[PDB]
């Protein structure tokens, strides 16, 4: 069973001996710190952490003793605030005397703004605010996946609008293939859920149960999949029987969309001769609601996409749409799901545009790039103390390292506001109290062991919409 | 609760309908495919077998849940309810799978078979690749362990060169990665992988994983040290940094303590606060309880070098037997910002050029150690190599025309020692020719049971550096 006393950076066990004596309040905040582009971030995932790990009776006698026993050996020393944890157990029935205020989930906020704040609600528990830094900072991951996924949606929207005149099907154009490429089962659920903030297609099934339990949707499920082959279901037929494999698979899935990985031996042969000639009659007969989707999976991603489109365009009836771009027949599409990240996605769609191929023709799968190849420094997600009360006097505190101004933190009590022009601003030094800037956009989401304000996944999706979708 | 029927890539739900009719066996293998990182540490499969694959993993309720979810997820009924029911009824929900693997902690060159998977009941031909997704997640502990060991090699080389020995090596790279990983579960897994090579970690989650799944003779596999963070310095107020420092070193007067010193001005902190105002509180400390000064910003090499130059003029420096400079034993440095395998190399080489012993310093690494890694780094990959259809075995493989690096191995595989004592993987069942001695893979899982396992102490032994041995 999870033990919050064993869920912090080891050194934090020692911090109750380090704060100034007579400190009754430690107040800290989280931001995606600005860096001298990812200019705005999607706030998502705190609600998961609050419910799974922080709410309710999280301290017990047994948990205190287990931590005491572990830390004794881990430090080869007795440092450990047994009395402080005892206090929470006795006085609050093991509920954390902490108040957390946050911007609503799904909100899209520029870099360098306060996203949430954390403070103790009992003077005895001044040490607790930063104890939970470690667990709360892991919110970096769903924030960063959701943000990077949204930035890819923006690229897709731009090019789809340019080459087709509308955004039909945008939400299906980036498909999560990342389950095997993430570091754990828990990470898979969290990351998949964050991608679904922006899109509707995923093979990372773990995201579904996460969303159902912690957020919820009106619809039965938040994400969808489609039948598809893997190399094993092709190669198992034998090298001389690739066509037999293709024929069997498209016939098994004759009335639903089906993707068939076509690069086991020679992608270009498969497109030109197997799909384009030998099995063409099984493809041109298909429904618009049940296309064949050809899936390359190797080679230079742009070069391969372009050559695949070139081959198909000569074997199948191509039209030119109202924008002047080439369009495959509706029973045939392509998905590129190898080596796709935000940079290569851009290169591919721009390449297609230059060769006059509509983005209607293609969708993308992304695995490692979408869910794993991300770190906490991408958006500089960071948690810092900005205000303490010592001997009954509040003081505004901060770091400001001489050699790195980018690491300077904010001072004092903070609030987030709309500007007169409709943008965002973070007020420092308790200045929000002057009420010159309308209401604080941070809301209490956690107080004294209870989750006080929750968002459905539908609300989050609405909050994270692109401007172009709004238009 | 975990449900293995909902723990695969969605498209694999549809694969039972795509294999050749009358297929009775699907046999697959995992390798770190050949294309830096010439050899990999095999670690973490045992965690997966015990936590997710062993025992009764199918129930009626689990089957109904998955059926209900997939109906909505596909907007269609494609789920193999019959196949999962067969496992439940015939085997009391235990997986009819056999997995063979190299021993954990083993250090093996790229492009070798590390484990194999096959069904033990013809009805369950589809099950081999159902569990691809979970098993392939072993990439992460393999990669963390491997990259951590590569850093130990660097530290070993330079500590040996600058000091003449390896004393303390296992304390020189400290895991700071807990906040920087993607989840609690990842934290435990990755921290445990670093502990294959080192003994210091602030990622507490790894201790419990190791105790539950591997075990050590010692009470715990990893250790920590008291240390400040910016909040315990800055809370004192900007004009009271000296007060914070004094309080902290006085509270921790008889144990090692690290104190982050760059809140406002690292160079001032070192030269004036530690080097002058509080010097008397440092030179009185025990060799068993040094002050460790922690910079945390600026260019990592430049800042380490300047910090060392400052301390060397404020404190008595000696020259060790190798000709390198050494701080007094009550004073050390830890650099824990921006450290990855590349910057680690740059720092120690820069220290060596300026005649500073590696004895003076340790490294903390967070995102670099536990998060900034992908499955592409070692090309960790699972592929089918052998099938039996209509009673005939067939060697199968992929070999994409545009990328020879993605070519996979053919047929039944085995791992052997060569005459020179190296590893070789034999394909096409050739291990059965008995020209290369015994298969080095062992059966680790069979029909719901873990059949062979390793303590964390043995894993550490297997993962030792040549220089250590
Ligand atoms: O190939 C796999 C999964 C592979 C996988 C999974 C997991 C791990 N590793 C690999 N899944 C098949 C997805 C095919 C979906 C198609 C794409 C083309 N398409 C559009 O572009 C579109 C047309 C009209 C409107 C909107 C979009 C129509 C829908
Ligand atoms: O500063 C932190 C943690 C900060 C943190 C944690 C978590 C997250 N984010 C930040 N931990 C302090 C560790 C200090 C250990 C010292 C290093 C110097 N040293 C040697 O080099 C050595 C000398 C002789 C023999 C062997 C080694 C002696 C041991």
Residue numbers in the entry:
A (entry chain A): 8 to 43, 53 to 487
B (entry chain B): 8 to 42, 53 to 486
What did the study's authors say about this model?
NAMPT functions as a homo-dimeric enzyme that catalyzes the rate limiting step in the primary salvage pathway for NAD synthesis, the transfer of a phosphoribosyl residue from 5-phosphoribosyl-1-pyrophosphate (PRPP) to nicotinamide (NAM) to produce nicotinamide mononucleotide (NMN). Crystal structures of NAMPT in numerous ligand-bound forms have been reported. These structures consistently display a NAMPT homo-dimer with two essentially identical active sites at the dimer interface. Typical NAMPT inhibitors were found to occupy the portion of active site responsible for NAM binding and a tunnel-shaped cavity extending from the NAM binding site. Furthermore, we determine the crystal structures of six NAMPT mutants in the apo form and in complex with various inhibitors and present a definitive model to explain the differential effects of the mutations on various structural classes of NAMPT inhibitors.
The crystal structure of G217R in complex with APO866 revealed that the more flexible and narrower linker of APO866 adopted an alternative conformation but nonetheless could fit through the altered tunnel. G217R causes His191 side chain to rotate to the same extent as G217V, while introducing additional changes to the structure of the NAMPT inhibitor-binding site. The R217 side chain competes for space with the bound inhibitor (e.g., with the terminal phenyl-trifluoromethyl group of GNE-618) in a similar fashion as H191R. Besides introducing steric clashes, the R217 guanidinium group also creates a basic patch at the surrounding protein surface that favors polar groups over hydrophobic groups. We conclude that these additional structural changes render the G217R mutation more deleterious for NAMPT inhibitor binding across structural classes.
